[PDB]
Every structure is written in structure tokens, then in C-alpha cells.
Amino acid sequence: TTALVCDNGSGLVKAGFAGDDAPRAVFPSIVGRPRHQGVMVGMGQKDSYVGDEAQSKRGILTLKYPIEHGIITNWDDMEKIWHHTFYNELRVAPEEHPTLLTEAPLNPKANREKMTQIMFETFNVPAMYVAIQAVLSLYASGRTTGIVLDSGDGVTHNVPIYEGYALPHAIMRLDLAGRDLTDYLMKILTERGYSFVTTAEREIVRDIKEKLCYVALDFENEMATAASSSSLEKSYELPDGQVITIGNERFRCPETLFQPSFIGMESAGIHETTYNSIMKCDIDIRKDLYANNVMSGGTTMYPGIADRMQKEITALAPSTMKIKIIAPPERKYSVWIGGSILASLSTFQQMWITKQEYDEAGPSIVHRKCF
Amino acid sequence: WXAXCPA
Amino acid sequence: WXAXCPA
Amino acid sequence: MILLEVNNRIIEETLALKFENAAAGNKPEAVEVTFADFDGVLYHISNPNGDKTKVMVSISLKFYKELQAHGADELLKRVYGSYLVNPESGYNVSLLYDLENLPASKDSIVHQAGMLKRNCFASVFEKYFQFQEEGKEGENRAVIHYRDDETMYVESKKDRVTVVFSTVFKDDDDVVIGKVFMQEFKEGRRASHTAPQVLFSHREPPLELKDTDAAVGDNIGYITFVLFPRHTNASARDNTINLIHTFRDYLHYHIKCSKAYIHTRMRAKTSDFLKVLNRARPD
Amino acid sequence: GRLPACVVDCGTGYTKLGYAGNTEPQFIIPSCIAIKESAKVGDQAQRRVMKGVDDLDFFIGDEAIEKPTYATKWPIRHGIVEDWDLMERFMEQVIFKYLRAEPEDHYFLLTEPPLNTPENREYTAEIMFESFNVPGLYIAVQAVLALAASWTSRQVGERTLTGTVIDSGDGVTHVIPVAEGYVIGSCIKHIPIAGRDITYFIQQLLRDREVGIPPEQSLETAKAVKERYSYVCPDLVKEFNKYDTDGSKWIKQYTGINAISKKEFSIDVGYERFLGPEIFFHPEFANPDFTQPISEVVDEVIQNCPIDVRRPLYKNIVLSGGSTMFRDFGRRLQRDLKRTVDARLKLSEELSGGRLKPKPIDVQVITHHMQRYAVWFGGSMLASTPEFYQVCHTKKDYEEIGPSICRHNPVFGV
Ligand SMILES: Nc1ncnc2c1ncn2[C@@H]1O[C@H](COP(=O)(O)OP(=O)(O)O)[C@@H](O)[C@H]1O
Ligand SMILES: Nc1ncnc2c1ncn2[C@@H]1O[C@H](COP(=O)(O)OP(=O)(O)O)[C@@H](O)[C@H]1O
Ligand SMILES: [Mg+2]
Ligand SMILES: [Mg+2]
């Protein structure tokens, strides 16, 4: 009667039924194992606490993210998380309904083939499909033309689009994402006087950034006002009760997106990459692309990011037209909403890939299925 | 990745 | 140190 | 300990702890404990219900069916009086103490209850001895294999009684040690005057056990004790019963004691070896 | 009708004994063991070599104290054991006479101090597998058994795995935290001072501060500690001057009975009512090497583990062990820990200003029964668990690999 849409986000997993406006399962992608001897034999010990629980008891586990910068590194962890989400949380058998999967652009074909083979062989799903997060973002936004800023936890990419067609030759993928920002935040927090190394403190710093970070319209002016540090410093309460005061670090780490040179990467910022991508497009569609700029992902919720992007683009672009930035307040789950809407479409009921055709043809079929 | 970058 | 570790 | 005791001291201790505070008012002291002893039999002490004024003791005899078939009406009134009730746990004899009624004796009752296993075991041997004493036609021989895979057989004819033991050793380490232990059992007689004959046989089972489906195999020895009225009368009956019943655990414990003895001897010799070695270091 | 396994908690002091699946350790006897040794002089090339059957001519347990012709010789000394032949003799005596359990058809669980060296465990396991031929064996630290027994204090149904235990002992009291079933290996410290040297100090002071006792019946006189005769003291000098001022009502009296001539002898009770139990927080009195308190050790060990576990640990400290029976111990430890942790929090807040106010750290000490014995119930639940029958080392493992299967330790790994 319905289908399930699963988004294997680089740092989080979103899943739910096709038709619902909100996901029914939102847990981070953590597959933790005990570090200590395994000494206790009573009430509850399990070889690998992977999943939602892992966050609660992270203090005695070596948390490892199965997916790194959009590409899977450990297949056992991914299969374990898939099994957990399908059974423990959703409690829906794979055979009952099909599954929808999404992945970042410009990914290796090996990952796609392995994922399709595992899905068709292990869980024997009746049918499935592979799509792109940006197109689902367009579907969720209810628009047919624009440029997508899919700045996820692991990968940031853009895909120019036009009415009824796309431009595969103008796709740019940047490895910079939330994980690098967290690493830089840890490094600077070290320069302040607070040290964080293990993965538990990695989660702590991730929460701190999620709660007390914002972008700066002007870097130099903000630094000068920080020189007069009497109205910008803020305090955060650690689990142990210790209080940490954060000043310039609030608006320093986000600036790494516009200044990749801070981490040492010889690349350009998101504004420069979007400008280059739009310039590579045809002249006529440049106006439409400028007039519509959709952004999505968990790395673009920092207040003031839209204003800074607008200012930078207008400064770079000619000052004779109007540039508009659209920032929906629900961009976190835009990909899932788009996937659900696409699945609900009547015309898409035949585009699925079934077991019979997959077995007769082979894993290479998915490669030709909408690129 | 296999060559270039880690993943 | 001040936070984390002693020093 | 040299002669393994027959009185389980666990029941003695717990009953002493219970009774020493018995005259202290409405003191229930709810008790529920499970024990175990030789011969692979499980005990159980637990109140019958919420009423804690009564304490019950039970047994889980392996060969209980043979005892029930034989009939132990003698044991229901001689040693145990009115404080015995039908089985509850597993169709095995279970007794209880009525605390509401005054318990007059303290040590005699505890001692009587301590030997429960042997008290029930004697129901067959003493009855066979009575059969041969009374002049009644020799009762049909019986075989009584207890929890151990080995077997026990007894023949009660006129002018004498017989008993044969079958031995089985599990671990390969102790087989040879037990064989050596029992080899000299059949011969040591220079310090006993009024003692029965003893013999050992392992290759050729006795002709008595051919028809009986007793312990038959290859790595199984046999021990027989010839019985005569001079050491099986009403006076020297309890001692003989205790010795034969405690034969198995006696062998086991003394085997372990010999192992410890040899360990001590080798440990002592290590010192002499080290003293000999020390000749190499300089002054 | 499966047979229950056997539960034993060996140690330097009173050795607990009994069976699994039971709510009371039936037998609790000292480690005293008799022997038919006497005065030979050749005692280092033939320690005993008792001729004939005299080797086993020795008693055990409470009955072994009242044998005035042999030697009462304790085999254990704060975990480490010099000669283990006496231990083997005691083990056979107990299993046969008291327990009456056949090793070949039973499972034995044993407990040892965390500091026990691997060699002792390996060789005792070898001895067991060789002589007793026990089908299965398992050895684990006693902390987890105490934690499991602590559930009976309140809300058993409410699962609470986190906490920390500071157990007592005749010659050792250790500190071990638990973090949701998994303990920390490096955050363990061994304290040498225990409930025995305290009595040594008591008797040493008494032998000079009072007279009227015989040399033989000293320890029975020194056991006023086990009586109501020791209270802890928030302050030392205050009570000192309190006694030196009045010295009339606070002084108690002893009315012990001689065990030889049946002649009554009495002595007063003085400063030892509190000094002994106070030595725990001031170990420097007895052991000069270990000049280090306990509460600060507790906070230090709790401060050397991850952040996410520091908070719940302080909330669960279990009062289990004989030496912890002293009154007001929990109050002193709780107050000291609260003071130090609040001071640390205030210092941390001073350096970085802010109008905020962190929620105060909560430290609570729990008093309950089971304090005398918290290892027996843990062993009973250990045996009752079916997974125990599967984790226990098997015979074939020891057959050719060797006794190294029992060498696993919680503070080791490569
Ligand atoms: N409220 C927030 N503020 C800033 N960053 C956030 C916030 N919520 C999530 N994030 C960041 O966005 C990431 C969420 O993963 P995400 O961006 O959605 O990757 P994906 O798009 O592939 O699911 C996290 O790494 C987190 O650092
Ligand atoms: N009620 C008590 N008051 C004072 N000390 C006690 C009390 N009960 C036990 N003790 C002391 O605690 C010691 C026994 O503690 P325990 O841990 O059971 O010995 P073990 O380490 O062998 O298990 C004894 O030496 C005894 O002096
Ligand atoms: Mg994404
Ligand atoms: Mg102890």
C-alpha cells in the first residue's frame, strides 16, 4: 500500500512511511562496541551497541561513523544499522513494502552496485530505487528551477536545474562538511584552554556547535568587537557541571565554509563554487538560476547564513538584477519530504526496479537508471 | 576514497 | 589544563 | 576426616540455629534452601505454604522406585514416628517438624534426621538380613543401581549373605590410581581378625551377575564382601551398613588425599634438587 | 532436576560457604587450619612429610581453635598466599565434610582479590582441574557480586547498573567503579590497610594503657571493635578533650571471661572507641608507606574516568563489607566528598565568570543489610544464570592449552 524512504545521511538517518509529513525515525548513524574487557555477565551486555542507544552509553564505547564524507567504509556497520532501523524501530518487514534510497552525486559506482546487491539479496525487497537528495529537495520545495545547496554533514554539492531538465556537466562536490567544522572547532577550543579528543567529547562539541554557533556578516568587524569582549561571550553547561565560556569561536568555525584555507584545503568557498557552477551554465538560464536558490541540509541552519550568501553573491554578480535567497524553516527533512512525494507520484509506480529484471540483467542496471 | 582523501 | 585533563 | 561421616552437618547446623532461638515468641524465620550430598541426590528444605510454623525436609532419591516397590513400613514407625507425611516434591519421602507441639528432645531428633539418606537406604539391606535370619525362604535377589552409572547387587541365601560392588571411573587420570588402590584392598588382612573376605575382579565378572543386568563392560572392576552373622547381627549391623554405604566416597576422598600426599613429597624433593643445584654459584 | 552449582568466597578472613539458589550463606567459618606439626628442626627440606596417615590428622573451622596441641596457621595473608598446600587441604576438607559435593558433577565459582597475580590463579585452576576434576570453573572480582546484591536495598525492579563499591576485607579493602556493567580497568586502586591491622593497633595500645588480661586471650579482648564499642568522629581533638575533661560517663567497661581458669577479668574502654575506625581516613597511623586518605582516593578514581560516567557514579556508593559496619562512616564519607567536589566546582566557576549557577552535584551514601556478606548472593545469581554454564571454562580447554584459560584479568590486555 505504501513505500519506505530511507536517507543514509552522512551523520544521521531519516526514515518513515510514504505519505507522512514528518519522519517516524530520526537517530544518528553510530555503531559502537565496548572498549573494556567485557567483564559483566548479568542483565544486559551486547557485543555491539549500535544505534540510538549508543548515544546514551557513549562513555564506554568507541563510536565510529560507518559513512565517511558520503562514501561507505564499513559494510557490516551499514547492514547492522539497516537491520536495526527496519526491525527494531520501523517493525516492518522488507517484503511488505519497497524501499527508497538516496545518495550524493559523483559517488563511485561500486557503492551503488554493492548497496543494490545487498538490498536485493539479504532483505529480498520487492523493489527499490536510487535517487539524488537535491532533486528531492526541489520536489519538496515545489519548484522546477533553481540551484541546490545540499550542505550535509559529510558532503556539500550543487546541481543546477532548469524546467524539465538538469545540467550534469555543471555539478560540483565539496568534501568540506560538518565533520571538518567540528574538528576545527575542537582545535580552536584547544587554543582557548579546553581539550576534547575522544568521540564522546566529539558529540559534546557537536551539540555545542549546534546550540551556540552563528555566522558573521563581516569578519573583521566581528573580530574588532571581540577585542571589546564584554557582550559576545556565552556560557555552556557541560554534563559534569563545568562551565565553558565561548567567544570568537562562535563565528570563527562557520567562516571556514567561506574560507577553506583555514583548514589548509586549496579550494574555494560555497559562494565561489556556486558562482562558478552558475557561470558554466547557459546565459539565458543564469537569470532563472539567480532568481531561485534553494538550500538544504543540516549545515545551513546557522542564523545569518542566508544574508551573508546573498551579500556575497550580489557583490560577485553584476549589480543590475535582483538576487533572492529562499530559506525554508524545515530544510533539515526536505530530502525525506521530497522522497515521500516522489514515491506518492502515480507515474513513479512503474519506474521501480524489481527482483526479476535485476536478476536477469544484473547490478549494472541501476547505473543506467536515471544516471 | 581509495586514492585522494580517506573515504 | 583548565577543562579536560589536570594541567 | 578419615571415615567419611554419615550425619550431614548442614541440617544439624541449621536446625541448631533455628532451635536455639525457638523459645523466643512468634519467631517464624522463613527458610527455603536447597542442598546436595553424595550419591547425586538433592535435598530441599522449605515451608509447605505461607504458614512458617512448620518446616519440611525432602529427598530426591534416584532409585526411589525400588524402595517404593519393596515397601518400607518398618521405617515409617521405628526411626520416624508421626512426623512423616506423603511425598510432595517428586514422589520421594519427605518429613516435617511440628513446631506448635513442644519438641522435648533436641539432640536425638536432630541426629535421627541427619542420617536420612542411610536411614532410607537400610530399608532393603536390613530387610534382606531379616529374611535370612527369620528362616523365611530366601527372598529373591535384587539389584540397586543408584545415581552413579555403576550398579549394586545383593544375594541373601541361607547360612550367609553376599554383596558385590561395581566400580566406574570417569576421568582417565584416576582410572589407574583407583585400580592400584583397589588392588591392595583384596589382600590387606594382617590387621583384621573378625573381618570378611575381600576379592577383586575386573576381567571376569562373577557368575552371579551373568543373568542380572548389572554393570557390565570392560573398564569396570568388581568387589565382593562375604557376610556372616558374626559381623551382621543386631549389634554390628549399623556399623557395617555405614561402612558399605560410605565406601564409594571413602575411596574417592582417600584417592585425593594420596594425590595431596604425593604433591607434598615432590614439593619436598624440589628443595633437595635446588640444594644440589646451588653448588654451581660461587662463594 | 538439575543439580545446583557450588558458591564459595575464599579470602583472608572468615570464609563464606554455601550453595547457589539460596538466600543465606549456611556456613561461615574462619580460615584457621590445624596441622600435626611440632618442633622438628629440619623444617626447610622436609617441611612436614607426615608419616603414614598423620598427614590428614588435622581439623578445620571453629573446632580448630580449641585444639591446644597443634598449630593454628592461617594460610592466606591479604590475598597473596605463601604456601597453598594448606589451601588445598582446607578445600578438600570443606567440600567433603561441610559441602558434601562431588566435584566431578558440580560447578565451582571462586573469588580472589583484584590484585591477585596471574600465577596464583593459573596454578589454583590447574590444581582444581587435576585433583577435583571439576567440569567447569569461573573466577571473577567480588565488586560485581556486591553491586548485584545491592539491588535488594530498594527498587529491585528498577535496573541500576552504574555505581561504585568500596569493599572491606580481613587484609584488603578495594575500590572498583561500575559504568553500566562495564568497569574501568585502570581506575582501580589497592589499599593495604584493612580490618586486621586496626585490631593490631587496638591490642598494641591496650597492652600498655591497661593490664589485667592474659597473653593468650588477647584477640578475644581486642574484639571490642566488633561490638558497639567503636563510633566514628567528625572531629578528633574535640572528642579527645571531651574524654580528658569528663572521662567518667564516656568510658565503658569490659567483662570478658577467661578461657583457662574461668576467672572474670575486666578492663575499661578508652580512646580506642573511635581511633581504630578513624584510621581508615587516616591510614598513616598504621602503615607509614600509605599516607593517603580514602575519600580523596574515591574522588580521584572517580575523576579519572570519562565525563559522561562521572555524574551517576557519585550517586551510587554501596555500603558493603564487614569493616564498613562502623556507625556514621557513610555520613563522614558523604560530607567529605561533598565538600571537596563543591570546592572543585567553585574553583572551576571562579576562573570563568558567569551569572549562572550549575545544579549542585548530588552525593548520597546508601545503608542497607547484606553489609557483612555481599559476595555470596552475587555468586548465587552467577550460578543461577544459564549463560554461566556456557561461559565457564571447559575441561578440554585446560587439557592441552593449559591452565591459562583462567588468566583473564580486568586490568590487562594486548
Ligand atoms: N541546529 C543545527 N545547527 C547547526 N548545525 C546543525 C544543526 N543540526 C544539525 N546540524 C549539523 O548538520 C548535520 C546534520 O547532518 P546533515 O547535515 O542533515 O547531513 P545530511 O544532509 O546528508 O542528512 C550535523 O552534522 C550537524 O553538525
Ligand atoms: N560488625 C563488625 N564490626 C567491626 N568489624 C567487623 C564487623 N564484622 C566484621 N568485621 C570485621 O571485618 C572483617 C571481615 O570482613 P570480611 O571481608 O568478611 O573478611 P574477608 O576479606 O575474608 O571476606 C573481620 O576481620 C572483622 O574484624
Ligand atoms: Mg545529505
Ligand atoms: Mg574480603
Q: Is C1 on the interface with A (CB under 8 A)?
A: yes
Residue A207 in contact with ligand 1 by CB distance below 6 A:
no
Mutate to test the pocket of ligand 1, among A5, A6, A12, A180 (most ligand atoms within 8 A of CB): A12
A-B interface (Cβ pairs under 8 Å ≥ 3)? yes
Q: Can you give the CATH number for the domain in which E275 is found?
A: 3.90.640.10
Q: Do D137 and D277 fall within a single domain?
A: yes
Q: Which three cell numbers stand for residue E2?
A: 538439575
Q: Do D215 and D163 fall within a single domain?
A: yes
Experimental technique of record? cryo-EM
Q: Which atom of ligand 1 is nearest to the CA of A10?
A: 22
Mutate to test the pocket of ligand 2, among E31, E226, E318, E326 (most ligand atoms within 8 A of CB): E226
Q: Do D95 and D189 fall within a single domain?
A: no
Does the CA dihedral D269-D275-D276-D277 come out positive or negative?
positive
Asked if CATH classification 3.60.9.10 holds for the domain at A1-27+69-134+334-367, the reply, yes or no, is no
Query: What are chain A's partners, defined as 3 or more CB pairs within 8 angstroms?
Result: B, C, E
Edge-to-edge strand list for the sheet holding D84-85:
D32-37, D41-46, D54-58, D94-98, D84-85
CA angle (D160 as vertex; D156, D162 as ends), nearest 5? 55
Nearest CA to ligand 2 atom 25: E170
Pick from A331, A350, A354, A341: nearest CA to A18: A341
Q: Which atom of ligand 1 is nearest to the CA of A104?
A: 22
Q: Do D154 and D90 fall within a single domain?
A: no
**Which of D66, D96, D131 delimits the end of a domain?**
D131
Query: What are chain D's partners, defined as 3 or more CB pairs within 8 angstroms?
Result: E
Q: Where are the domains of chain A?
A: 1-27+69-134+334-367, 28-68, 135-181+271-333, 182-270
Q: Which three cell numbers stand for residue D141?
A: 535377589
Q: How many independent structural domains does chain D possess?
A: 2
Per 3-state DSSP, chain D is made up of helix, strand and coil in percentages (nearest 5) of 40, 20, 45
Chain A hits for C5, CB-CB cut-off 8 Å, are 195
Q: Is B4 on the interface with A (CB under 8 A)?
A: no
DSSP string, E197-257: HHHHHHHHHHHHH-----SGGGHHHHTTTTTT--B--S-SHHHHHHHHHT-SSS-EEE--B
Q: Which three cell numbers stand for residue E49?
A: 612429610
- Return the ligand number nearest the Cα of A207: 1
E-B interface (Cβ pairs under 8 Å ≥ 3)? no
Among partner residues E161, E306, E413, which is closest to A59 by beta-carbon distance? E306
Containing structural domain, residue E256: 196-285
- Fold agreement (A1-27+69-134+334-367, A135-181+271-333): yes
Containing structural domain, residue D168: 133-283
Q: Do D222 and D276 fall within a single domain?
A: yes
Chain E hits for A45, CB-CB cut-off 8 Å, are 181-182
Q: Do D113 and D137 fall within a single domain?
A: no
Q: Do D161 and D227 fall within a single domain?
A: yes
Q: CA-to-CA distance for E98 and E110, rounded, in angstroms?
A: 17
**Contact indicator for D35, E5 with CB cutoff of 8 Å:** no
Asked if CATH classification 3.40.50.300 holds for the domain at A28-68, the reply, yes or no, is no
**Which of D131, D163, D197 delimits the end of a domain?**
D131
Name the pairing type of β-strands E182-183 and E252-254.
unpaired
Question: For D101-109, which contacts have Cβ atoms below 8 Å and span 24 or more sequence positions?
Answer: D103/D19, D103/D22, D106/D19
Q: CA-to-CA distance for A370 and D68, rounded, in angstroms?
A: 84
**Within 10 A of E405 (CB to CB), how many other CB atoms are there?**
16
Chain E hits for C5, CB-CB cut-off 8 Å, are none
Per 3-state DSSP, chain E is made up of helix, strand and coil in percentages (nearest 5) of 40, 15, 45
Query: CATH fold of A182-270, please?
Result: Actin; Chain A, domain 4 (3.90.640)
Q: Do D146 and D267 fall within a single domain?
A: yes
Q: Do D180 and D82 fall within a single domain?
A: no
Query: What are chain B's partners, defined as 3 or more CB pairs within 8 angstroms?
Result: A
Asked if CATH classification 3.40.50.2300 holds for the domain at A135-181+271-333, the reply, yes or no, is no
Q: Do D66 and D193 fall within a single domain?
A: no
Q: CA-to-CA distance for D259 and D264, rounded, in angstroms?
A: 9
Instruction: Kindly list the protein residues whose Cβ atom lies closer than 6 A to any atom of ligand 2.
Output: E 11-14, 168-170, 195-196, 225-226, 321-323, 325, 372
Residue contact A194–C5, C-beta within 8 A: no
Q: Which atom of ligand 2 is nearest to the CA of E198?
A: 27
Q: CA-to-CA distance for A324 and E147, rounded, in angstroms?
A: 63
Nearest CA to ligand 1 atom 4: A210
User: Residue A362 carries which DSSP code?
Assistant: -
Chain C hits for E348, CB-CB cut-off 8 Å, are 2-3
**Which of D110, D131, D152 delimits the end of a domain?**
D131
Q: Do D182 and D257 fall within a single domain?
A: yes
D142 CA → ligand 3 middle, Å: 83
Q: What does this entry list as its resolution, in Å?
A: 3.9
**Contact indicator for D157, D129 with CB cutoff of 8 Å:** no
Nearest CA to ligand 1 atom 23: A9
